[PDB]
């Protein structure tokens, strides 16, 4: 009932930040004076107070006056940031009113199912996931990875000295993600693939709207991951950075309460299934609020959060508080806290969900689509769909995937090769006939039905051609 | 020549972040499916009024106010559009260009091909150096008494720190350049065992703890040194535009002649090479909470920092950078404006030193000789020195001492918490290092100097003892 066998002996060994025993008769002093730290006294500070002026919704253009939060130099509100502490040296883990807002939205959204674990302010999801590296893996250990995933996680597990370790994704319009059947197969013949490699220490999954893929693993889907994590005793590194962002299947384009929304449309977290804090939970303030903001948090056993600390002591010494005052009392302030804020990430599902369908009409209504030359996974979650080329089976994947992207780029449509986001490109290279779209990035309804038609016409001529940029 | 063969490996072996067919024009005006981030239309903020005060102090001819818009065209300027949303990872432009020009303003580098990278602070600067000068097994030449946390990143890189011993004379540089040169000159004698020095971490102005200053003639010593036997300086420099004049009995100096006679000319200004990393940072003369500063040094050593950056501390806050950059133009109109700042800023720190040192000098505890001060040439630190005989444990009268000043309402730092190694140091860790920068107001500095020398003088009183 914990983890400490999982923490690395490399993150185990960090040191901490009179110790001695005082004279028979000393008292300390009731109200001492400082002259100790090296803290310039808030007085020095060119910043006396701050406006934040807010949109309501998201593609507001500023009846109503303007929503603002003020910020002073001075509050006795525990639930605020003030500029005399926001502005001054802080706890590395994080300001107090941020670290406790965090405990209660991941209670609200996602409890950990045992009572040991803790919250710890990062810079955002790549720092969160560099914190989760260093935790859990030493110089030698395997990490499971995606066979596609969030490329910059290999730097974090390479400067760990991890191996990565590619898991096949299924890419079934029904599939949870990962292929549960040759994920069971790696573990139960481990010896047979990696005679020379260790057993896996760790999973990284993006198990919610998993990038680039888009799937989201099912309740029962997590439920089986965990017992064999129980079972081979390996970490689940969790990331999370839109899985608030749920998507309805798709219907053709032309009020979802909180209770409704946590019951019946988020996918339960890993920490839900946790009992001994084999697992730690990357979140990111980055798609839901800003990423020019550099801010998260990680969730995890206190042991394992003490590990982190002693690591961003040395490489990363706080999140900004400057930010971390901003973003807690825009959160307090205006959005009211947990339930408040919800409300925000619920206006944001419904643009996105637009969005998405919008994308998928583009491409289904498309010639490309109807001859068969494309499809779409519907994603149940976040920013990005798996646009699949059905290229013949005896083609080139590589080869033909590199000419019809300079085609795509000659049309005007940027997009992400799926052999660019893979552990292993070998590995992977038969299922890499897929190319990431994003519909984050668009200004407006036009510039999507556009991308989608560019998309497709692309490919069409690319077909029609015989497989050639002629 | 350049700094290329003082790069770690490991910083070195670090990464970065086909063919075109034949008739491939690209698009004049592509759309990007490519880029997974948000419009900033999802951004909840629009725009940021920043209220400043005129002065450090000043108590709330409107205030001095900075808007931030979602979209700006200046190019000195950072927007919410911008600021808000993905950058590249060695800062904003518009930032960058500040540090550039501020930089060529009060410390010119020797050689055309530097540049500079924004980091999260001064520890970030020096972790960041740390790494990208020291490979597992190399040896970092430290000031025997430091900026402690400095020890966990070259701890990190697998370096040995060895101590270089401090002269506590109260005319020192700092170093005791006697004993350095012993040091290079006879190296295997000292250490037979360990490799040449590959660095050293010098805070060379307003030394933490001891508050030396190195001589323009001393840092040219220093770097003829670092040429001669091949080694990288890490130079750390938060508060050295704090310049303080030498003490006066207490009761509008102007940027050029500042720039051309108070300041101490930077190892940037010495070095032709790159062999120099200059640390930076915003805490000490914005506010720490930032957590924003930036490092100067040869292009290539900022290439190989860029790349370790990728992998450990992804950005400075793009907010933060918005904030502090156009507060930095917009309020103060760019590089001289913000000398004014600091300026305002030094005298506040002048007349708090002197002030404190007055305190001590007024005592029975200095007029018996059971103390004495070194009078600081720049920054916020202050040498206490307590004359213990000879043939006393200075760690163990320390430790009592230490017991008694907190007893008596005065907390400061013991010398020997701040020690690469304490048995080098014990014999000159017969001091406490005090700060005046957090005191709210004249009076706290003064009863903060009366509890320090009642304290010291009750202890001597006593025989060395709590009594
Ligand atoms: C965007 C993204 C991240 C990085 O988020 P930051 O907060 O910008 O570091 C990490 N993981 C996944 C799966 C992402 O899509
Ligand atoms: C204060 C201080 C630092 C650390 O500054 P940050 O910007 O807060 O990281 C480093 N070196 C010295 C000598 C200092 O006094
Ligand atoms: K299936």
């Avoid at 040191?15 to 001695?20: L, N, Y």
């Avoid at 859990?136 to 996680?153: M, R, Y």
């Avoid at 998928?360 to 769909?385: C, H, N, R, T, W």
Wanted: a negative charge.
């Amino acid at each position: 009932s914990d983890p400490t066998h999982l923490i690395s002996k490399r993150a185990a060994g960090r040191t901490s930040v009179p110790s001695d025993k005082p004279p028979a008769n000393f008292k300390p002093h009731e109200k001492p004076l400082a002259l100790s730290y090296g803290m310039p006294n808030h007085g020095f500070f060119p910043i006396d107070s701050i406006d934040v002026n807010l949109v309501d919704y998201p593609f507001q253009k500023i009846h109503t006056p303007q929503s603002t939060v003020h910020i002073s130099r001075h509050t006795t509100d525990p639930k605020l940031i003030d500029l005399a502490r926001g502005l001054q040296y802080a706890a590395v883990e994080g300001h107090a009113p941020l670290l406790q807002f965090a405990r209660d939205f991941i209670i609200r959204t996602h409890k950990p199912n045992y009572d040991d674990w803790n919250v710890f302010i990062t810079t955002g999801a790549s720092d969160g996931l560099n914190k989760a590296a260093d935790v859990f893996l030493d110089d030698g250990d395997v990490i499971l990875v995606e066979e596609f995933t969030f490329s910059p996680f290999l730097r974090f597990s390479d400067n760990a000295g991890a191996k990565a370790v590619p898991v096949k994704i299924n890419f079934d319009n029904d599939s949870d993600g990962i292929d549960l059947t040759q994920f069971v197969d790696l573990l139960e013949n481990w010896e047979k693939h990696y005679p020379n490699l260790p057993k896996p220490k760790a999973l990284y999954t993006i198990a919610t709207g998993q990038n680039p893929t888009g799937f989201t693993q099912s309740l029962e889907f997590r439920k089986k991951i965990y017992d064999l994590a129980v079972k081979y005793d390996f970490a689940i590194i969790e990331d999370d950075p839109y899985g608030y962002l749920t998507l309805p299947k798709y219907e053709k384009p032309n009020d979802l309460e909180i209770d409704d929304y946590l019951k019946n449309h988020l996918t339960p977290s890993y920490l839900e299934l946790d009992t001994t804090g084999r697992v730690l939970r990357v979140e990111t303030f980055s798609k839901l609020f800003a990423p020019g903001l550099r801010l998260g948090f990680i969730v995890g056993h206190k042991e394992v959060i003490d590990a982190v600390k002693n690591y961003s002591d040395v490489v990363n010494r706080g999140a900004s508080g400057l930010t971390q005052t901003i973003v807690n009392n825009v959160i307090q302030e205006n959005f009211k806290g947990v339930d408040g804020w919800l409300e925000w990430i619920l206006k944001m599902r419904l643009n996105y969900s637009y969005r998405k369908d919008l994308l998928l009409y583009s491409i289904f209504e498309s010639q490309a689509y109807k001859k068969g030359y494309v499809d779409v996974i519907d994603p149940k979650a976040g920013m990005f769909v798996t646009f699949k080329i059905n290229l013949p089976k005896d083609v080139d994947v590589l080869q033909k995937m590199k000419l019809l992207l300079w085609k795509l780029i000659s049309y005007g449509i940027l997009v992400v090769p799926g052999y660019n986001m893979t552990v292993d490109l070998e590995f992977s290279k038969d299922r890499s006939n897929f190319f990431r779209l994003c519909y984050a990035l668009a200004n407006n309804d036009e510039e999507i039905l556009e991308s989608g038609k560019r998309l497709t016409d692309a490919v069409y001529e690319f077909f029609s051609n015989g497989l050639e940029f002629h």
